[PDB]
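Consider the following assembly input.
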Amino acid sequence: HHHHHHMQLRFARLSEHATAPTRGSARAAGYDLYSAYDYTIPPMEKAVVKTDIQIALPSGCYGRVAPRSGLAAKHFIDVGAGVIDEDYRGNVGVVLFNFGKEKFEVKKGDRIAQLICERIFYPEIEEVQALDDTERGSGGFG
Amino acid sequence: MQLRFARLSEHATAPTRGSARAAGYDLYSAYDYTIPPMEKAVVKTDIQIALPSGCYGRVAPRSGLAAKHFIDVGAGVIDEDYRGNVGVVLFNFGKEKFEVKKGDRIAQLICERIFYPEIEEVQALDDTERGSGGFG
Amino acid sequence: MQLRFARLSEHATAPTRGSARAAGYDLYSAYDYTIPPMEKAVVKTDIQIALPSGCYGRVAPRSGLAAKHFIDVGAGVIDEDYRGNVGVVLFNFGKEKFEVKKGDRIAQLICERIFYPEIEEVQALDD
Ligand SMILES: O=c1ccn([C@H]2C[C@H](O)[C@@H](COP(=O)(O)OP(=O)(O)O)O2)c(=O)[nH]1
Ligand SMILES: O=c1ccn([C@H]2C[C@H](O)[C@@H](COP(=O)(O)OP(=O)(O)O)O2)c(=O)[nH]1
Ligand SMILES: O=c1ccn([C@H]2C[C@H](O)[C@@H](COP(=O)(O)OP(=O)(O)O)O2)c(=O)[nH]1
Ligand SMILES: [Mg+2]
C-alpha cells in the first residue's frame, strides 16, 4: 500500500547463555538452533533443551524444529514435538530423543536442531453431512 | 478454501483450535487404547476430511505428550485426495503404558502448503556451492 | 513447478506419484539392506534432485511401513541447493529385522513451501 518491505525473523535473548540463530548458506531451509545449557541424555531417553531465545515469526507461517542430518545418521538423535506457533512468545525448547545405545552429551553452544519457516493455511473449519469421493477414496496404509 | 469434515460415527469430536494463530487443529481419539512401553497403535478419529486445495494435512505431535510422556507421531501424511478415516499412528517410547480414552486430544493437524511439480529426468545436474556433501 | 532428477547409477528407480493429488513422490532403495531391531540405516536412492524455488524437500515416512512394521524416517531436510545423492535415514523400532530390497518403496519426497526471512535481533519483541 504505502510501505514496501520484507518480513524478518525477529528474536530476543532471554539470557547471556543464548546464541543468535545462524544460516549456513543463502538457501539453507533452516536457521541453526543452539543449546543454552549442558545436558546428558542417557540411552533411550529424552530431554527438553532450552535455547533461551524468544521469537516472533513472520505472518503466515509456523516454525518447525527439525533434526540435524549428521546427528540422526551418526548418533541416532531425533527431534520430538517441534511445532512453534506464530503467536508463541516464550522460551523456544527443543525436545531431543536419544535412541542410541550410548549416552549423548549436549554442551552450551552446540548446534542441536534447525528452525524452518513453513508456509501454512489457517482455514475455517466447516462440518458437513458427508464428503465426495475421489479416485484415491478411502485407500490408506499401504 | 476451508477445511471440511464429516463424522463417521457419534464417537468423533470436531477438531478445535485454541487460537486464531495456532498452527494446528487438535485431533481427538474416538476409541480407547492402552499402548505398552515401546509399542505402537493406530488411533481412529472417526472423521473424514477434505483439505483446502494446495496443501496436505500433516498429523503432528502435541508438545506436552512428547516432552513428558515420550510420545511421538509416526507416518502423518494425509493426501489432499484422501477421503477415508483419519488415523493417528502413535509411538510410545516411554517405560510405562500410555492410556488413550475417547475424547482425549492426541495430535494436531497442520495444513502444510506444498507444490505439485511435474517430474523431469536429465542426464546430470549442475552443482551449486553446497555440493554433494551432506550428513555433517 | 518442475522437479528435475538424474540417476547416479544403474540401480536407481525414477520417483513416481501414487495418486493425482498425492503430497509426495515415492522414493526407492537402490541397494539391499538388513536393519536389525532398534537400529538405523542410511538407505541410498542413487538420485540427485533439483527442487523448484521456494521450497525444500522433506523426506517423509510411508504410512503402511509405520503402522505395520514400526518404521520411521529420521533427518529428512533436503536443502534447495543440495545436488548430492539423496539418502533416507530409516529407523527400525520393531522387534524383528527389517529387510530393504533393491527397488522397494521406502519413503516419499514432499516439496514443502517455505520462505527465507532475514534475521533481526531486538531487545524487546515490540521494539
Ligand atoms: O498418519 C496417517 C498417514 C496416512 N493416512 C492415510 C491418509 C493417506 O492419504 C493414506 C496413505 O495411504 P497409502 O498411499 O496407501 O500409504 P503408503 O504411504 O504406505 O503408500 O493413508 C492416515 O490416515 N494417517
Ligand atoms: O518442540 C517444541 C514444541 C512446542 N514448543 C512451544 C511452542 C508452542 O507454541 C507451545 C505449545 O504449547 P501447547 O499449546 O500447551 O502444546 P500442546 O497443547 O501441543 O501440549 O510450546 C516448543 O518450545 N518446542
Ligand atoms: O534425510 C536426509 C537429510 C539430509 N540429506 C542431505 C541433504 C541436505 O541438504 C544435507 C544436509 O547436510 P548438512 O547441512 O552437512 O547436515 P547437518 O544438519 O548435520 O549440518 O544432507 C539427505 O540426503 N537425506
Ligand atoms: Mg510445510
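The interface with chain C takes residues 6-13, 20-21, 23, 25-31, 54, 56, 58, 61, 66-69, 72-73, 76, 78, 89, 99, 114, 116-119, 134-136, 140-142 of chain A (CB under 8 Å). Ask yourself how this observation constrains the way the partners meet.
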